């Protein structure tokens, strides 16, 4: 069996070498080989057989530049504790990079058709910016977080070919697993696995009577045990259902709500991304989707659209009757226009679920867009960022109801500026907000380029009225903004510092208010000793100027934690007094992603879960929508109405 262990090392080495060298671009192979060579890790370097190729950043062809090449083969997540909210089965090899925070990393979609496909997901739990940045004395120097690498769920092991081979065509490769801190999540129980010592570290094999299948390789770690607390086993039964009052949305694939809205008749909409056939037949990898509910909880229609590439619905807004939707695509959604491979889109749906038009910005420059708003006059605003040194800059774009572009405003600093907010006032003006490593509206007090929050006010012509910036010396991260009926601008985010008050521990939530003239009115901060943050579409403001916030916590923020991260929602008045704070979820990972206030004192909070929220989990990530009473945060049945029982 010594001979069998030697044969496994050869077959794994030759299989990974073949796939990584065929798929990864030569610029990426060259960088990775240099890091491994410099660290004297030849076993890793010798997996990459492409020629040494110069790394380029200043080509006139964006497609020849390292960031654009890297973008195709990566999911680069945020400074937050992130679920992989950008996962999609669109490449054979993908780098999944958590960066700071306690990330819940998945790359595989167990509901996708991957029979016979090569799949390697390369996981970096941390590999925080400070590890690459040579400047000394950063606040977050040496910091690491507990990352969870998801290699199976209650339904099935991931990367499983279930055949007569060692199952080398599909595998995870985890590069920075720390058994003192991180977790590897597996299907089944410890009797279903064998650990094998290989040249690269540890091989995790699925083992049954019929044979062996490689599930993952743990780079640079040896002599682990399946009895370790760093392995979490999910068994083979769906989790018990909680919150049967929720609307449940799920397929066997990874399904996400990322946004919601309401129209002038009280119809409630949700939308996001899916790796499955949720609102229609899957077109390939992740698709965008949206669904309409009447004011009584009844689904009217669902729609799914996209490409063989990756797209999501990240924002939606209504003019009262139509539903405008925005997000990102790696495909070509508008047949009149070229595809850049990483492009913003805007589409218009009518109340009957017809796609009236779609507009795509087909340029080769990397573009992301997570935010949309509609004004009184029915004009549409989107916001996002575009990536002569390499860097993101913010933009706002204004359109008419026929999808004609009225103007585009681009702005920012010499360094990273990301957009996480757009909101119109009732007065022809539009606000944007986001994160910057630089000094955009103030000198950034961060000594190693830690993020601050920024806000811009633009007028009806896209000219800048003002820029503001606020922050601590540590990372502060904005997720979302909204206007009230007076035209004041509110932003929400997390901080690792003392922004509105003394940090309670780890990530805390903040809520900032500026007046229309750029004066900061107040910043509130709240949290537990644990990780608390709003997320994605995390603020809304009703007709009465009540502020609603939503996101996730792994503490006891609104009540006892059910397990992992839970969702939370809060109500504030326009002077920043907290009126209520509710927490809800499953024993498994949950987060809210969006909040929509409606009328008759009801509110919808929607999000994602790895558990059974509303009904039995259909596979991996599922989504949910909860109807709350706006007076006290009490959960109502989604289908509750005054005319039914
Ligand atoms: Br060497
Ligand atoms: Br980020
Ligand atoms: Br470091
Ligand atoms: Br996307
Ligand atoms: Ca992260
Ligand atoms: Ca991390
Ligand atoms: Ca980690
Ligand atoms: Ca396998
Ligand atoms: Ca797709
Ligand atoms: Ca910039
Ligand atoms: Ca800061
Ligand atoms: Ca906290
Ligand atoms: Ca939970
Ligand atoms: Ca699912
Ligand atoms: Mg449908
Ligand atoms: Mg919002
Ligand atoms: Na299976």
Query: Are the beta carbons of 561 and 568 closer than 8 angstroms?
Result: no
- Is residue 213 marked as binding? yes
Distance 99 CA to ligand 5 centre (A): 5
Nearest to 409 by CA among 387, 388, 431: 431
- Residue 249 and residue 209 share a domain: no
PDB experimental method:
X-ray
Query: Are the beta carbons of 454 and 447 closer than 8 angstroms?
Result: no
End position of a domain, from candidates 201, 233, 265: 233
The verdict on residue 329 lying in a domain is yes
- Is residue 365 marked as binding? yes
Query: Are the beta carbons of 608 and 593 closer than 8 angstroms?
Result: yes
End position of a domain, from candidates 233, 263, 286: 233
- Is residue 498 marked as binding? no
Q: Using CA atoms, how far apart are residues 485 and 545, in angstroms rounded to an integer?
A: 6
The verdict on residue 319 lying in a domain is yes
User: Which residue has tokens 């607390």?
Assistant: 229
- Residue 168 and residue 296 share a domain: no
- Residue 249 and residue 224 share a domain: no
The verdict on residue 68 lying in a domain is no
Give me Rg for the CA atoms of the chain. 24
Distance 502 CA to ligand 12 centre (A): 10
Nearest to 138 by CA among 392, 439, 496, 391: 496
- Is residue 152 marked as binding? no
- Is residue 103 marked as binding? yes
Q: Quick one: which ligand is closest to 476's CA?
A: 11
The structure tokens listed for 452 are 């601050």
Query: Are the beta carbons of 82 and 76 closer than 8 angstroms?
Result: no
Local structure of residue 265 (DSSP, 8 states): T
To one decimal, the resolution in angstroms is 1.5
The verdict on residue 315 lying in a domain is yes
- Is residue 97 marked as binding? no
Q: Quick one: which ligand is closest to 129's CA?
A: 3
Q: Using CA atoms, how far apart are residues 410 and 499, in angstroms rounded to an integer?
A: 28
Q: Using CA atoms, how far apart are residues 246 and 42, in angstroms rounded to an integer?
A: 52
- Residue 227 and residue 79 share a domain: yes
- Residue 192 and residue 83 share a domain: yes
Task: Provide the terminal-to-terminal Cα distance of the chain, rounded to the nearest Å.
Answer: 66
Strands 315-318 and 299-305, by their bridges, are unpaired
User: Which residue has tokens 């986001």?
Assistant: 434
The verdict on residue 310 lying in a domain is yes
Nearest to 11 by CA among 225, 191, 213: 213
The verdict on residue 212 lying in a domain is yes
Distance 48 CA to ligand 12 centre (A): 42
Q: Using CA atoms, how far apart are residues 230 and 185, in angstroms rounded to an integer?
A: 8
- Residue 259 and residue 148 share a domain: no
Strands 148-150 and 104-105, by their bridges, are parallel
Q: Using CA atoms, how far apart are residues 64 and 583, in angstroms rounded to an integer?
A: 47
Query: Are the beta carbons of 525 and 508 closer than 8 angstroms?
Result: yes
- Backbone φ/ψ region at 147: left (φ over 0), alpha (ψ -120 to 50), beta: beta
- Residue 256 and residue 225 share a domain: no
Q: 166 CB contacts (<8 Å, ≥6 apart)?
A: 8, 11, 12, 15, 205, 212, 213, 214
Distance 133 CA to ligand 9 centre (A): 35
Distance 304 CA to ligand 15 centre (A): 7
The structure tokens listed for 234 are 């999910």
End position of a domain, from candidates 233, 257, 275: 233
Q: Which domain holds residue 203?
A: 74-233
Exposed / middle / buried, residue 91 (Cβ in 10 Å: 0-12, 13-18, 19+) = buried
Distance 81 CA to ligand 10 centre (A): 24
Nearest to 370 by CA among 428, 317, 327: 327
The structural domain count of the chain equals 2
Distance 524 CA to ligand 5 centre (A): 24
The structure tokens listed for 250 are 């799920």
Distance 289 CA to ligand 15 centre (A): 9
Query: Are the beta carbons of 248 and 613 closer than 8 angstroms?
Result: yes
Q: Using CA atoms, how far apart are residues 272 and 303, in angstroms rounded to an integer?
A: 11
Distance 282 CA to ligand 15 centre (A): 11
The structure tokens listed for 215 are 């599930």
φ, ψ at 327 (rounded to 5°): 180, -150
- Is residue 181 marked as binding? yes
φ, ψ at 245 (rounded to 5°): -70, -20
Exposed / middle / buried, residue 642 (Cβ in 10 Å: 0-12, 13-18, 19+) = exposed
The structure tokens listed for 526 are 């709240």
- Is residue 246 marked as binding? yes
- Is residue 147 marked as binding? yes
Exposed / middle / buried, residue 548 (Cβ in 10 Å: 0-12, 13-18, 19+) = buried
Distance 620 CA to ligand 14 centre (A): 5
Distance 473 CA to ligand 11 centre (A): 5
Helix (H) or strand (E) holding 478: strand 476-483
Strands 532-541 and 520-526, by their bridges, are unpaired
Q: Using CA atoms, how far apart are residues 576 and 580, in angstroms rounded to an integer?
A: 12
Report how far Cα 600 is from the mean position of its chain's Cα atoms. Answer: 32
- Residue 277 and residue 224 share a domain: no
The structure tokens listed for 629 are 């009473």
Any idea how long the chain is?
Answer: 645
- Is residue 418 marked as binding? no
- Is residue 248 marked as binding? no
Exposed / middle / buried, residue 135 (Cβ in 10 Å: 0-12, 13-18, 19+) = exposed
Question: Sign of the CA dihedral 182, 188, 194, 198?
Answer: negative
- Residue 301 and residue 227 share a domain: no
Distance 170 CA to ligand 1 centre (A): 28
Q: How far is CA 460 from CA 258, 412, 532, 546, 607, in A?
A: 28, 19, 36, 26, 34
- Residue 218 and residue 126 share a domain: yes
Q: Using CA atoms, how far apart are residues 313 and 219, in angstroms rounded to an integer?
A: 35
- Residue 296 and residue 319 share a domain: yes
The verdict on residue 497 lying in a domain is no
- Residue 336 and residue 314 share a domain: yes
619: number of CA atoms within 13 Å, CB side?
A: 18
The verdict on residue 122 lying in a domain is yes
């Amino acid at each position: 069996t010594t001979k069998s262990l030697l044969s496994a090392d050869e077959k794994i080495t030759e299989s990974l070498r073949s796939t990584l060298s065929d798929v990864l671009p030569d610029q990426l192979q060259t960088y990775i080989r240099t890091v491994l060579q410099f660290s004297g890790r030849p076993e890793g370097a010798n997996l990459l057989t492409g020629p040494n190729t110069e790394i380029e950043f200043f080509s006139q062809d964006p497609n020849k530049n390292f960031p654009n090449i890297f973008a195709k083969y990566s999911n680069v997540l945020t400074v937050s504790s992130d679920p992989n909210f950008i996962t999609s089965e669109d490449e054979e090899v993908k780098i999944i990079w958590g960066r700071h925070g306690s990330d819940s990393l998945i790359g595989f979609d167990p509901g996708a058709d991957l029979v016979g496909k090569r799949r390697i997901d390369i996981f970096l739990g941390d590999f925080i910016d400070e590890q690459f940045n040579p400047i000394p004395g950063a606040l977050n120097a040496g910091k690491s977080w507990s990352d969870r690498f998801i290699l199976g769920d209650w339904q099935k092991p991931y990367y499983f070919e279930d055949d007569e081979t060692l199952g080398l065509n599909q595998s995870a490769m985890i590069l920075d697993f720390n058994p003192n801190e991180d977790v590897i999540q597996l299907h089944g129980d410890r009797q279903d696995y064998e650990l094998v010592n290989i040249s690269l570290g540890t091989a995790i094999f699925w083992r049954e009577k019929k044979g062996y299948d490689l599930i993952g390789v743990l780079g640079g770690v040896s002599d682990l045990s399946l009895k370790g607390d760093y392995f979490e086993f999910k068994g083979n039964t769906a989790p018990k259902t909680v919150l049967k009052t929720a609307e449940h949305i799920g397929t066997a694939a990874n399904d996400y709500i990322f946004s919601s809205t309401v129209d002038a008749k009280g119809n409630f909409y949700v939308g996001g991304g899916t790796g499955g056939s949720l609102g229609g037949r899957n077109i390939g990898a992740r698709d965008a989707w949206l669904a309409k509910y009447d004011s009584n909880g009844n689904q009217r229609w669902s729609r799914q659209f996209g490409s063989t590439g990756t797209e999501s619905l990240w924002g939606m807004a209504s003019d009262g009757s139509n539903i405008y939707v925005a997000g990102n695509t790696t495909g070509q959604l508008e047949n009149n226009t070229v595809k850049g491979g990483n492009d913003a889109y805007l589409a218009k749906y009518d109340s009957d679920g017809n796609q009236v038009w779609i507009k795509q910005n087909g340029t080769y420059t990397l573009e992301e867009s997570y935010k949309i708003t509609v004004d009184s006059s029915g004009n549409i605003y989107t916001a996002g960022h575009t990536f002569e040194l390499p860097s993101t800059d913010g933009y706002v774009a204004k359109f008419d109801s026929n999808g004609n572009q009225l103007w585009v405003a681009q702005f920012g600093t010499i360094t990273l500026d990301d957009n996480w907010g757009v909101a119109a006032d009732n007065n022809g003006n539009v606000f944007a907000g986001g994160n910057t490593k630089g000094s955009f509206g103030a000198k950034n007090t961060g000594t190693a380029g830690e993020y601050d929050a920024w806000l811009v006010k633009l007028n009806k012509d896209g000219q800048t009225d003002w820029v503001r910036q606020f922050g601590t010396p540590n990372y502060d991260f904005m997720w979302d903004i909204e206007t009230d009926s007076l035209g004041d601008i509110y932003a929400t985010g997390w901080t690792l510092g003392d922004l509105g008050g003394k940090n309670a521990g780890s990530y805390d939530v903040w809520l900032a208010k500026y007046n229309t003239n750029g004066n900061q009115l107040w910043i509130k901060q709240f949290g537990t000793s644990e990780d608390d943050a709003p997320f994605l579409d995390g603020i809304d403001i009703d007709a009465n100027d009540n502020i609603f916030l939503t996101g996730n916590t792994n503490g006891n923020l609104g009540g006892a934690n059910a397990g992992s991260y839970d969702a939370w929602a809060a109500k504030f008045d326009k002077d920043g007094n907290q009126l209520w704070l509710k927490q809800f979820g499953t024993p498994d990972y949950d987060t809210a992603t969006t909040v929509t206030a409606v009328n008759f004192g009801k509110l919808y909070v929607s999000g994602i879960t790895e558990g059974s929220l509303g009904t039995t989990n259909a596979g991996s990530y599922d989504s949910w929508a909860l109807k709350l009473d706006a007076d006290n945060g009490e959960i109502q049945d989604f289908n509750s109405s005054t005319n039914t029982f």
